[PDB]
Amino acid sequence: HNMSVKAMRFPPKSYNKDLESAEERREREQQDLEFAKEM
């Protein structure tokens, strides 16, 4: 089992960008949220 765990460390690659949500959709969420608090 443990060698099938140590030998399972060769596929992990190309995990580059972990985008949280967005930037522009966060800005429009701030705009529409500011409008909803403005109402």
Binding site: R9, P12, K13, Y15, D18, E20
Partner: protein, 40 residues
């Protein structure tokens, strides 16, 4: 004996560089996937 002596260390240190570098490249991606899980 500077040829047979001093050049006999560059041939050896590089072997540690090659596989410990590989272990580092394994282990930092190892952390990477988990870090993406944390932020996500």
């Amino acid at each position: 004996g500077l040829r047979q002596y001093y050049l006999s260390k560059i041939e050896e240190l590089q072997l540690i560089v090659n596989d410990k570098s590989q272990n580092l490249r394994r282990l930092q991606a190892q952390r990477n996937e988990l870090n993406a899980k944390v932020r996500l």
